[PDB]
Design a protein around this nucleic acid. Structure first.
Length: 362
RNA sequence: AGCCAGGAUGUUGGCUUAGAAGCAGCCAUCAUUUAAAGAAAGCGUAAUAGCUCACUGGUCGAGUCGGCCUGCGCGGAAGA
RNA sequence: CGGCCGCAAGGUUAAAACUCAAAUGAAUUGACGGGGGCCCGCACAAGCGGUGGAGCAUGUGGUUUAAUUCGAUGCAACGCGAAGAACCUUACCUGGUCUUGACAUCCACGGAAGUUUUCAGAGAUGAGAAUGUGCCUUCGGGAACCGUGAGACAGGUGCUGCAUGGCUGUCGUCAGCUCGUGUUGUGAAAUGUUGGGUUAAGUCCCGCAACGAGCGCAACCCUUAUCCUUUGUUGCCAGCGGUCCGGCCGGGAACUCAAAGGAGACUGCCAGUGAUAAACUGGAGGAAGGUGGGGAUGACGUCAAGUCAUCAUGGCCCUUACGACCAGGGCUACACACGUGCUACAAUGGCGCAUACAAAGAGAAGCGACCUCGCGAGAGCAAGCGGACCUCAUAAAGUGCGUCGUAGUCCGGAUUGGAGUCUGCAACUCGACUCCAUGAAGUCGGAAUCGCUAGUAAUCGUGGAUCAGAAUGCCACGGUGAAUAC
RNA sequence: CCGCCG
RNA sequence: CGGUGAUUGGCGCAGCCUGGUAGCGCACUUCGUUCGGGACGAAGGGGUCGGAGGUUCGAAUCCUCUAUCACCGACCA
């Protein structure tokens, strides 16, 4: 009730003892605080202004881990005294002490694991059954079940934007929307195909069926926050339009060209018998491509997201779910494994996500 | 108004920091000597450092310096 | 593509790269056909009663959970393993504990073992405190266990039934499946096994490049239906005597019955049909007539079907833990879906009173008369019985009378409150039964679907296994008892 | 009469 | 720009015009059929009518603007 939280914090701190590699960090701090005593490195500011920032950025972790370790040990000795001298007055305060320590610890994890930009977003996850018939469809439905059982246990909202069933069994496609606070910061660990080795119940011979379901998971934006541009120079021009068959070429100028300093957007409106409505409709066709290029840059960023690490041969294959011969779930980037596959398929991929972020943080 | 001095205390404190010291900040934002001095108003320093300012004494030899109401002017004020 | 020809459609002549390791022909065996012939099976038809609607019981899927252990999961999983989960079982979860260990063998050491009582603890455990200290004798010394230490090991309901054995389902109790020798074909193969009849049957007869054989079919086995011989109890009472009229007692061995041993039924006989055949139809007789009824009996194989969780087992893997011990919980959760059942919706019925007729089985920490007490479940005292003797044990539908008079009603009996009984350390999660009270849905069930050919379906009760307690399931038993098959 | 697929 | 006519289930359309009274087909859900899938049956759910404000006891419906959508005209010099 108290000592189990200490015994689990002692395992959760070695996660960051390995995932930070603290001896390298204190060696870096030691080789900075020996050389920054001489004033020649802080003479010209253009190196020391980044050197003090890097020194503080490593100093943050090499104080925070030792602070969490000392606040672990001073409660460990206190609980050993409570299991040694039975102070029920100290056992009243130790529960609030453990509550405050867990409130600090999971907050610290949320600091250092999630420095990436699109971690606050809602992870639009998407499953494709890879290749084949009704076993790779069933594996897509099993992965759907595991991800919804993780999202609702996490308290997130699974919206299921798109869906497509399988013909006999399984699914053929699904596109979810996982409304959550740190949704993409957790579901970064799901990019890549999943491998399922089992015996197909849709078989008859009992062949071991190995199956591959691809999972592409993006962060969503739904931003749609763009109104005007006017803080730059909207270089406009009024000129006689390119036309015949009227009094425009004889008398007056109606056409409106608009030129922008952002990305050189130039728009012409020339065919409405009055210059003023050409300005108004040229403003409409200003926004009618400013929003379009906004979608182009959103799509161009997200295409880099969906093409970050899609070149490694077998390293794109993570998460082997062995069912039939020996029943183990293994991750092929972090090298961790859980032998109870049913608790994994019921949605306890939390360890496989924390090991992923703890590996990619180092 | 000038000119000459002084313009100092426990004192660098609890933090953002290898250190934030009267002036990148948020609190404490005061007790001493006096004729007076803000754990300081400004420049300046990575910060300290320097430099002035408030304020206070000496020469000086009398009117000064701001705010309101008004009269008349000034700039704003470039075309074939 | 180029040439020639053509009004055109196009014809004729005619490549290459690339690509694959085959494409193709004829024949053989199977399988398949919305090809053909013949034949069959509750297959359809002819009927009867259901399931799907309702409420509950049980199992499964999902969902939930700390865990809802594991397995089967078209037919051929889903009242299945489980012939019975409160603890145990239990394999699962949470917490507390142990490590050569709960269970084995070996080594060394100390003590007989054993019995009683207290403290702490949820208990496992640890601390104790007394009694005891048997038979050997090399009587330092052993058989017996206890306790400790060390390690070979032990342990695993951990994995793989797609490494296996054994056991099982299945097509299917369907009538097939093969072989030896011979002959035929270059060969795969074929023939036998096909054909005419016939049969429940590759059953039999006849023919025939086949001749034979084997596993199957049939019979041999159990049971049931009739009779006879023996024996006559704790079973029976036909004839006599008494009877308190109860086979109750003398008696009897008749009969029912009990069991052992035989007989009987084989198309045997008759007639007709049919190849002078097998057989088929009909009749006599007989208790039974055409394998009399029912069972057991499961061919070569099929499904890499099921089970490594009954056991055994090759190989992996854990080994101060995936092993071991305990307490509590869970296996019984509940937006929902399915399977299999029980109870109903009533008048061919409900209730009240009276009254008749069974079979089969179980029983010694067991079945438990009588009598008393209790409305009752039951309780007390307590016979008899290791059982043709005693007990379970009242069969109920049935019949006679009365009443209800078609209403959600004297139908239904779920759900819930209160009071209890018993089992077991213990009935909260979660037992069964009783009493009082309550009185839900339900008024005959959509598409769809199941079983059954005669003592069958339908309905009615009884008993057993498992089991301290805990069947609406399973396995057996008798009562009444059909409709229909053109 | 209608009877597609694996 | 105005003129003119529409926004009803997840989709395509009704209903509006006449003030009370939202349905059709597909699709979805469950059950059935099937070795399974489709097809086919049998049950069942489905929207508070673009938004806002008035008329009235009452508005999806009658007006009023605001948004969106499509058609028509935007002329002569």
């Amino acid at each position: 009730e108290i000592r189990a939280e200490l015994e689990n914090m002692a395992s959760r701190l070695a996660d960051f003892r390995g995932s930070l590699d603290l001896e390298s960090k204190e060696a870096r701090i030691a080789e900075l605080d020996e050389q920054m005593a001489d004033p020649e490195f802080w003479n010209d500011q253009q190196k020391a202004q980044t050197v003090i920032n890097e020194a503080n950025g490593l100093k943050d972790y090499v104080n925070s881990y030792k602070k969490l370790n000392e606040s672990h040990e001073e409660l460990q000795m206190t609980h050993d005294l409570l299991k040694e001298e039975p102070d029920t007055d100290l056992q009243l305060e130790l529960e609030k002490e453990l509550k405050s320590l867990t409130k600090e610890f999971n907050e610290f994890e949320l600091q250092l694991l999630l420095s990436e930009p699109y971690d606050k977003n809602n992870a639009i996850l998407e499953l494709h059954p890879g290749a084949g018939g009704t076993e790779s469809q069933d594996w897509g439905s099993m992965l759907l079940r595991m991800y919804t059982r993780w999202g609702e246990r996490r308290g997130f909202k699974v919206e299921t934007l798109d869906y497509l069933p399988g013909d006999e069994a399984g699914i053929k496609s699904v596109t979810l929307l996982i409304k959550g606070h740190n949704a993409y910061g957790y579901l970064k660990a799901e990019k890549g195909v999943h491998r399922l080795v089992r015996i197909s119940p849709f078989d008859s011979s009992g062949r071991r069926h190995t199956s591959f379901v691809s999972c592409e998971v993006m962060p969503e934006f739904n931003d749609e926050i763009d109104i005007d541009i006017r803080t730059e120079d909207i270089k406009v021009d009024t000129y006689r339009a390119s036309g015949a068959g009227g009094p425009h070429v004889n008398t007056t100028d109606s056409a409106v060209r608009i030129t922008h300093l952002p990305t050189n957007v130039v728009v012409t409106c020339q065919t409405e018998r009055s210059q003023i409505k050409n300005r108004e409709r040229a403003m409409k066709m200003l926004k009618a491509k400013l929003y379009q290029r906004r979608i182009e840059e959103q799509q161009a960023e997200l295409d880099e997201i969906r093409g970050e690490q899609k070149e490694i041969g077998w390293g794109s294959q993570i998460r082997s779910y062995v069912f039939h011969p020996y029943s183990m779930v293994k991750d092929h980037r972090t090298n961790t494994e859980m032998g109870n596959v049913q608790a994994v398929m019921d949605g306890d991929i939390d360890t496989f996500i924390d090991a992923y972020l703890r590996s990619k943080l180092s």
